[PDB]
Amino acid sequence: APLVDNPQIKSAELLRPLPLYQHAYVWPYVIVWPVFLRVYLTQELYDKYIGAQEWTFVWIISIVTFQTLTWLCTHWSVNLNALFTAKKASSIEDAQLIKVIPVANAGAADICKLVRTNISFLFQKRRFLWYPERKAFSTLEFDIDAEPKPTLSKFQLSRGIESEDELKRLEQHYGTNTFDIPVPTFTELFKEHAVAPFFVFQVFCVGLWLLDEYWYYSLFTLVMLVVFESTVVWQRQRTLTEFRSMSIKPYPIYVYRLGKWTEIQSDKLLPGDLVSVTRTKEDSGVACDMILVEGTAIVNEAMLSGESTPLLKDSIQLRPGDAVLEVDGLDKNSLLWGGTKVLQITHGASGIPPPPDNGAMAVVTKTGFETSQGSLVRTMIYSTERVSANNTEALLFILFLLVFALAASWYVWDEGVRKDRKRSKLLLDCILIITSVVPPELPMELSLAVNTSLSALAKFAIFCTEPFRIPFAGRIDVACFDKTGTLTGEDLVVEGIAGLGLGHTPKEADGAHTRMVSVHDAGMETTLVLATAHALVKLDEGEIVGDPMEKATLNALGWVLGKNDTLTSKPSGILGTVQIKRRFQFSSALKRQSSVATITATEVKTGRKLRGSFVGVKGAPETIMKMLVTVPEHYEETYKYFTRRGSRVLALAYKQLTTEGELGANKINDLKRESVEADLHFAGFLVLQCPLKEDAKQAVRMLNESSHRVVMITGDNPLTAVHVAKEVEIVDRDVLILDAPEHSVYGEESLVWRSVDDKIRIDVDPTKPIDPEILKTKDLCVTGYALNKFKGQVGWKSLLRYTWVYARVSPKQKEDILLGLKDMGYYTLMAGDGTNDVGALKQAHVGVALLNGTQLGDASVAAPFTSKLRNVMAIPNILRQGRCTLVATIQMYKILALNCLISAYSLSVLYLEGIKFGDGQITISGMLMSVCFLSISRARSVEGLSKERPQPNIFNFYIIGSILGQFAVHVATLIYIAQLCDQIEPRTAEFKPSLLNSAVYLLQLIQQISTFAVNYQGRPFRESLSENKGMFYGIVGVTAIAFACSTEMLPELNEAMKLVPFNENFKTIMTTVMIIDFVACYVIEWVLKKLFSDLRARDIAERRPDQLERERVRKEKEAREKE
């Protein structure tokens, strides 16, 4: 819509509210009320149209029903609210209401209120302001969000807010800095929930049963509806409370307001306000997004990204003030994001005095609900696709049930018309028959199953942010995995330093130098690079924190770490002091990390005094071989041999900028990234044996043997990824790597299929399609370079269908892989840890962030699913719960509808003969069905996954066929019992006990019990009926009650429900009929479950016969070893 210029807003219309007397649910019904009044009190129209006082009551009920329906249509439909309440008056200068309809599956539509001079409104707790130059409502624009990018001179010399009237203008404009989610009480939430259409339908059914003189049954179902809606309201309140726990509590911060330092809570924070950041306390990150002006902040973005590696946010005072701000470039580490824990504040411009507490100066950019964590919280709460939104499949199923209802009700209306019954009683019977089929809990059953799955998943420390991806986990075809941090533990051990003799020794046939010296016996330059090229920082308490790889190589180095970013070695191969002056941070797209430092290092055995400035860079060996001077002979073969064993290899390089002396202050030290990560020498290879997680192999073999495909997406080498995937059993056949034959600047021009042992070499033109022999008989590994060369070609859709290891991929390449896998129709799971997967975690159908730590807030916004533990077994469990979710939904979609259908036709078999159900009988039947529902609701899951897959859709052949077959069996037994009862006694108004009423009541009781016992899903996805002995005994108790009052063994139970005594031959025939009905229902359900319930695995997840034979042999061996 041009009125609101946002991508998530579909329609916007500037309404104007009308008075209450002009409302469309008031004025025409007030107009037509005296017509009915003149019909009623004035005679000669009493017999003209209505004819009776019961018809008068029917017309009064119909008019009141139409009035309350026209009132409720303004509440359960936004467009009908705009039609019936407010006139259009499409002009900006007089509008007061804005109808906002968002795009599909992006929250609930609303009629927002215009508040104003700045014209604004609030939709989904997002503030929209009217711009007259654009002539449209739009999202709030900050100083950062300006289209001309501001210079740093307005940020270094910001000096805080300097005007009181401008402070009040900022307060009225951007609002206060709070996570404004209002949790509702029980009263207003139940008031909103009592206006929902299925509550209205249930209350209308209660009134219909009350009109037919059913006191106890209507009271029971009203009490049950009240407590069920109370349960739903408490569930929604609990969910909103756990969402409210994600908010940062206010804590006193020192801001610079009116030229003075002032302590104030974090609820009052406006953009452009100068603030001082210190060490944050527990259960609090920082409030809102800031940019560092003066100081260095060691922060931890465990909220925005899954990993807990602390980054080193620098300042902007070293950058010139005339430079254009680059949020995605040099000043990426300049900003500080909200919700993130700052681990340290160190000082290593505007003339302002320093803060009383030793903190860094920052400027607020994005405050309130529009900060990045807050903008994710707004999407996760108000702008998400809700589980409780009524699907069209459930409504079409309800319409199918209503089609069956009308099929029964038309026949009972024709039979009552032909037999000349009372038309009001016949109409009430037909409306009762129609209304006894729609199950009011049916559209909300998926939400209940999702909530039960969330409560089950919270046991394994798995917290789900967006609960509409729980059914998606029931239909996952591809289960993508990261390698490092997901299938690999964080306790890395340094194997050592390799390739010291490159260009200067055991050599293989391909020339690979296998001499791996230890870190202590390494050279001086290798030791200085390992002491220089890291992002390690010592906290004020005295704990070294950083990358686990950098911590591992620090512990292998034997060098202590000082206070002012210095590292010393006391009298281990060399002795001296290094001090890092500038530090270029590591990026996943660059695959390197460099640092400029000052060295004073002496070798203990020869001397060789190395002083002065130094550049140490470590990274991926292909990038380093691209950016050094002279590539040594057999460079590629060394790292390919040390990667063929599965170890992770980095390259270390050094460059002396000034040699003897010093570089000179920080004026020269402000160099460029591309001007210092070039013309390098070679220092060595850092080889680390990254250890596999203990649960990785078991979880991946559980996923592969359960109709899921496991692929590996990782930024590491092809050989490490291939060796891990062979250990974890992702790749079974011979593998082929699609990569450049040489990773130099000239050799990166063609693509080659290569073997791991470097024996097969096949040239590939990327425009030509892939050879089908390679796709069919070989597993494939694809490098991100070869993926980038396959961006817009025909073979790419082949590659994503036949590759299970992706290596050397950028985060954008992981996003491209997951988008392409989404585009082919495969549902995707992505399990990731680092900041290289946050694009991938938000593009998969379900994304899990594996927080590597072993023993509501502190839940990351990087992924919709967050596993607090480090185990890989949290990945199948989610999928298991997802499958169970669908399975639970399926069983309720097979029970409730069938239950209602039975009840409807039972009423029909009564209402064909003029007899009605007893009040006590139908109340006892409803109580027993509620008892069986409570008995069947409590069921856990099995300890493993299965090859069968549940059907996601509800209109499949299995569910519809089973329901139709069981309904046909039930209606055949009901018709036969009715004909037998008419045969025994002829048919010739209060409730009087009869043989037909007792037989129909006993049949509907035993048929509801039979469809509870038959349609319960069992062994392939959950426990069986016999295993939950509480559930089995609860079903068997009602079974024994029904069969005891059917055998006439207890006359007290038969006289309690007003059941006539039965003839012995009739009793035997009816017991045989009940057994035949239960047996036929179980046979039909078992046949249709064995035939059509198993949703077939897709072609990417189908396994070859040798894999199935190996799986069967291993399962037989484990079953033998169990004995």
Ligand SMILES: Nc1ncnc2c1ncn2[C@@H]1O[C@H](COP(=O)(O)OP(=O)(O)NP(=O)(O)O)[C@@H](O)[C@H]1O
């Ligand atoms: N601290 C580091 N310093 C230098 N280079 C690094 C560092 N960490 C990773 N790299 C390199 O960056 C490359 C790709 O970046 P990245 O994807 O972040 O590593 P990764 O964690 O192994 N990928 P992944 O397995 O998906 O988590 C790796 O193959 C390493 O060579």
Ligand SMILES: [Mg+2]
């Ligand atoms: Mg990772």
